[PDB]
Amino acid sequence: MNIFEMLRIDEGLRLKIYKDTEGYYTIGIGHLLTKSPSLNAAKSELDKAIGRNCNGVITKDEAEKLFNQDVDAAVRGILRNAKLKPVYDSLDAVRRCALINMVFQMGETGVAGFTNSLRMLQQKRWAAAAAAAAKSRWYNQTPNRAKRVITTFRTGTWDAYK
Numbered sequence: 782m783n784i785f786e787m788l789r790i791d792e793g794l795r796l797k798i799y800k801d802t803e804g805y806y807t808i809g810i811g812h813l814l815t816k817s818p819s820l821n822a823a824k825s826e827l828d829k830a831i832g833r834n835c836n837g838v839i840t841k842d843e844a845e846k847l848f849n850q851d852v853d854a855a856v857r858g859i860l861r862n863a864k865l866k867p868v869y870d871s872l873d874a875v876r877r878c879a880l881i882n883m884v885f886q887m888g889e890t891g892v893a894g895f896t897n898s899l900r901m902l903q904q905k906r907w908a909a910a911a912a913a914a915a916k917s918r919w920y921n922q923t924p925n926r927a928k929r930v931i932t933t934f935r936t937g938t939w940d941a942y943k
């Protein structure tokens with residue numbers, strides 16, 4: 782299993798604009814287009830991102846290109862982030878995938894807000910980190926996904942995805 786396979790299972794692959802759980806316009810593999818309520822703006826956003834007139838629909842190949850970019854951005858954002866970096870550095874590999882997963886979904890700012898879980902991850906108190914992360918809006922909004930990512934962090938293994 783790798784970060785890509787991990788995220789594809791968690792986001793699914795959709796070729797036409799859709800609303801996320803939060804009502805936000807998204808496309809491809811969890812690619813946020815806009816928080817704006819307007820589908821018009823979502824379609825604009827979309828043609829600008831692809832560099833073509835899509836009329837709200839894209840190809841698998843275009844979805845993958847956006848994915849390659851979003852994942853790369855998650856990774857560099859962690860590595861440049863004063864708060865996220867020391868955490869990432871301190872972890873083993875599978876747990877590192879968990880943190881990237883979280884940053885891809887909520888952004889570097891969202892994740893930096895999980896102050897208490899970040900601190901226990903650093904301190905290697907797995908159970909405490911899981912319990913803290915579980916008390917979050919994230920958790921209550923997309924529970925199956927959150928449980929999988931949490932379990933990943935908790936255990937250091939890929940069991941939840943297997």
Ligand SMILES: [Cl-]
Pocket residue numbers: 894895896897898899913914
């Ligand atoms: Cl927290």
Ligand SMILES: [Cl-]
Pocket residue numbers: 915916917918
């Ligand atoms: Cl809560």
Ligand SMILES: [Cl-]
Pocket residue numbers: 922923924925926927
């Ligand atoms: Cl879910």
